[PDB]
Point group: C4
Chain length 358, copies 4
């Protein structure tokens, strides 16, 4: 597998163009694994078009200070209200793999989410993180010893939250991967450390009782990731979740489902401040960060655009994408009259009943 | 007429691609007879786009068991909540014609619907069915002796329900067939057995009084097929129908009518459990099966995708399509938190007022 | 000007295809005069797409008789619920001009509307009409003697109604005609008979007072044509109109206005049976005739499709288009459970809030 | 920089075609500076498509007089209800730059808006204006001496209103300019007159307190430009604004915001006659002028179409565009039954919930 290896900063004009650019340097199979989605990708398109359902108003300012994008989540002060989403197998995008992404995320000043299906060992990731904050993403194993194992791993790795991904009991119908007959070219050292001698995908099982078990034994706040329905959010909190991570997995799971942003207000209204909300699935612009905040998210998580940046320039390319989002958000703050992230949470959005074609 | 004859399993990634694939092996006229629809096909497109009006939520599970797709209708236990729709002239798709479809349907474990306009004799179909359950579809004849004849045929053929198709008093404005000057290359042996010596299309007449007559004399439960309006459903039940088959005939009849799925909730609310509902016209994915169930159908009927599978691989190709739907539905069950078909009937759907372009 | 001259019947599969077909035989300038509309034609497209806003239901029959398309308007029994719209300069489409259209309309058995801007003399039209019913369309002249003149002409010509076109005070912004620098190649003998010695387009002025004047002096029922707003319909009736002709002139006048069919229900509700309603602007299918009837029109008027038929086959080609509409409507009647034109007035339409893309 | 220099009248059929025509004579970088907008231009498209959300009705007349497009704003009688929007750097379009635009605007008989970022000196503009009315557009400087300077400039230049642009604290994300690496080829003499010896873009800061300061010290009525939210309109008036200028800067500022016309009714309802409203951002047709008037604007401002006319023909080309709008509006008046600009303010618009695709 001939992944790119060049390390360089990139001039990000917008994140959409990074997809086609990365397609020229990433092997075909791996690129389509990253870029593709379930079915004919209608729900991936819905994730993108949902942002046109609620529109920003330019507005007058009420404060004289320059804008400040910093915020805090679970006690971590971060430079901007976005974190890195947990994504498997960064080596499909770049030879420096998860260590490269971790270096970009740590140097930028936000939180790295580590997929249990990382292609890098934690020691490799730890070198890139250089002490930066990290959260650990897990799937629910049928074998409860494996859950005890991975929770111990997360604690030993300095994780300050667990991300329990609920929406991946089985894979989505990812037509690109089926047609390409795609096969992972490398292993999963973190899960293999624990599975050796005891099928990896088939080891995973979630219900409210599962959430309760993980929350009771992790010693860390647990986000439940993949929530799209408000009653699930309520049930997850009552079962002990310390956070709700609104997501459809980048449209890589259930097909013919809503665009993720369209589900956020109903969830936020039901959560009603009880726990923090992370929002993902389709964030491509600073305007999207702002809209998610205005709609009840505390932070968003970034995914594909960062991986495409990693493909194009390693840690410096991924850093360029994070820098782009921070600068893009700053512009949106100026033009919406917002001085800080809290102001963005208070924005009034214009409801567009016409949708994408207007 | 040089229909395909090869028998093989096929790797179904999605059913949409089967249309173009079948177009390469089926003679032009017959293929466009199968694939085409009335007018400029806007209502066929509406049947397809209607599925984006109600979207599935991924949700947490409440049961530990593996998913089970089986269900029961009119006392028949079937492997999945879909049956074969009655379709004329399977010999346009494959030399093994209705016997090939019947073998796939019986081996899979669901119900075969036999069109009165079959190109195969019942003995030919019976060999494929090998004892499997079958329903018999009829049109209302103007000559009441022909109705007595075909009801006797159905009983002699072991049918356990009659499908009275109401929406075909005359043909739809099927532009493809007119422009191709298409002509059936073979006969209709089942109707000819009774019509000989006594114009076939012109023999057919329906009103509530017709439904009452068929229901009173068939000795079998009667589904009325082609219903799209709730008041017709109520009238049909009051006239003695034992089932409502919501359908627009695959958009092959009335043009500039709604997509069939959009009509289902209003019908289901009016039927209000009185009789079983079969839904068809546009089912292409497991998500569609689930949405129909959640909207009040007891089972769906499959049509064009199975015929395209038959064209590509005979009974094994048709079987591959049925297998695809069963596996696709299983995935949807996992991701919606559903353990069984009854759970699917209880799903909450997201209303998408933006329609297809979102 | 080299207009087609061939006379032949044509096999009409749909009326949309007649446009491109006619473009191959009609001189470029004249063809684009017939086919074009104001601005970028968005409102012509709206006239067409409006039909997808209200959808037909297939439904059970309640009567045993074969369908009958006949109806009556202002005492004239006509073979089907459509008449010929007043259209200028039929010689742009065919050398037999208005006489050819009149022969088709009379032989079919409906009403011919004669534009004051006919290229044929009345004697020429009269030969084609062969005694068939005719209505006379006028514009309001600034010179009231010209109004007295044309009303006398209409009476002498056997007209049984006047069509007062209100929506043409000035021409629409017809980009095709401006860019083609189109110029009428022949004269207007009917208006010239009266204008000689007394600038034709500039002779025309309407207000409720104008309607009152025409209705008081015509000796015939007056339809006011071009109505799109209900308050205008009420004002026109109170001023003495004997009919309301809902129309946007085939989108050839005001741009960025609604599709004509979308305006019909509000007008019909306000008219509330007081006078007959003629509907036009975008009728292309039997389904459109049915929908207009169900929405409050007594008849529709046909325009461009008949002219395209005339271009392709003279009176026999125009006849073929009328025959197509009658047969198309008959099919729609069968499938909607309608035995006669009154049944069509009682149809329940499905409201499609998604519009054209569904 | 090789700007066009030819002076000629042009035959304007519609203003949309002027864009492509100007692209053939304006240098690539400057043309894309004029034509482009933020992001992928979705909000520029929204400005255009918003006009299809409210549709005009053709209607009967209630007055006998010929239409009159004149109106009055802030005591200035103008020939038609549109003015020239403030636009920087007209020299990108034509060598005669702002003097050419000013000559067209003055000769036509409306108000010229002068951007503080003009490429022409005021003396150059004054020659073109030849005494015609002018308003002066400013940005809020951080250095309050610069605000005192520019307000003195405006008064010395005979300005009769100040346009305080609020929506440009920083530049929009104008992808065309970033990708073209566009750089202004000439200077800004008006701002340089005051900035010399005391970074131009970075000199600009607005809040209600800023509006109050400008309104208290200008000696002239102050319009606040860039308003899209009603509460900002109320706050601006309470702070001393004498006018509200509804605008999104031609979509050159905040991305993923509404089309400007969609924001106008809510603003007009809140302003509730307190001060005049100027509307801009997307006006391309006489129908748009009429719709803005009917929705609460007193006049509209024209932008890109006039600059494209200037590129194609200098002052005579810009004049041709103004003449086009006046003639186009006259047609719309005739067909809506409107005799004067006040009648246009009273029009009833058809609400189109289907949007652009209908
Ligand atoms: C290539 C790829 C791999 C992913 N791997 C994981 C994973 O291992 N665990 C997980 O919880 N989510 C995974 N996700 C989902 C992401 O966490 C996140 O929800 C998604 O990337 C957001 O959508 P976006 O990148 O289109 O904005 C993955 C997504 C992609 C595209
Ligand atoms: C080629 C073809 C032949 C059909 N023949 C019949 C028939 O003989 N009797 C009947 O009731 N329906 C017939 N139908 C309608 C089907 O029963 C069913 O309603 C339709 O196939 C469902 O639409 P779909 O296949 O697009 O999902 C036919 C449909 C097709 C496409
Ligand atoms: C070429 C052409 C000429 C027309 N001439 C007249 C006319 O002279 N008088 C009139 O009242 N309407 C005239 N109309 C409008 C028609 O009466 C009618 O409203 C229109 O054709 C209906 O739209 P459709 O043909 O697209 O269905 C004309 C329309 C066309 C296309
Ligand atoms: C090339 C260009 C330059 C502009 N410069 C200014 C400016 O200097 N000051 C300002 O207030 N608005 C400026 N605008 C915004 C215009 O005043 C106006 O709001 C916009 O042109 C209206 O949109 P439209 O031209 O698409 O109809 C500019 C617009 C363009 C296209």
């Amino acid at each position: 597998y001939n992944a790119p290896s060049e390390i360089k900063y990139i001039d990000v004009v917008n994140t959409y163009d990074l997809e086609e650019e990365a397609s020229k340097v990433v092997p075909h199979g791996g690129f389509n694994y990253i870029a593709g989605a379930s079915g004919d990708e209608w729900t991936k398109r819905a994730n993108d078009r949902a942002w046109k359902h609620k529109l920003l108003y330019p507005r007058l300012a009420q404060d004289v200070e320059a804008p400040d994008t910093s915020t805090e989540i679970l006690g971590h002060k971060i430079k901007a209200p976005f974190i890195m989403a947990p994504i498997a197998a960064h080596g499909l995008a770049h030879t420096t793999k998860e260590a490269g992404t971790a270096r970009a995320v740590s140097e930028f000043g936000t939180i790295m989410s580590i997929s249990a299906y990382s292609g890098a060992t934690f020691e490799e990731i730890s070198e890139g993180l250089n002490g930066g904050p990290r959260w650990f993403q897990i799937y629910m194993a049928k074998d409860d010893q494996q859950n005890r194992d991975i929770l111990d791993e997360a604690k030993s790795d300095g994780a300050t939250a667990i991300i329990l991904t609920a929406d991946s009991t089985v894979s989505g119908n990812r037509d690109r991967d089926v047609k390409n007959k795609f096969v992972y070219p490398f292993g999963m050292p973190i899960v293999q450390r624990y599975l050796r001698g005891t099928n990896i995908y088939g080891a995973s099982k979630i219900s409210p009782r599962d959430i309760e078990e993980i929350a009771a034994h992790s010693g860390l706040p647990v986000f439940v990731k993949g929530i799209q329905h408000p009653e699930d959010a309520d049930m997850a909190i009552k079962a002990g979740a310390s956070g709700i991570w609104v997501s459809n997995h980048g449209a890589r799971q259930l097909y013919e489902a809503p665009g993720s942003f369209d589900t956020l207000p109903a969830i936020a209204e039901r959560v009603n401040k009880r726990v923090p909300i992370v929002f993902d699935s389709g964030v491509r612009r600073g305007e999207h960060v702002a809209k998610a905040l205005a709609s009840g998210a505390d932070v968003v998580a970034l995914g594909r655009p960062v991986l495409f940046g990693l493909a194009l320039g390693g840690w410096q390319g991924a850093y360029s994408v994070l820098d782009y989002f921070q600068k893009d958000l700053t512009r949106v703050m100026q033009l919406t009259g917002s001085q800080n992230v809290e102001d963005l949470k208070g924005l009034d959005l214009f409801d567009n009943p016409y949708g994408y074609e207007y």
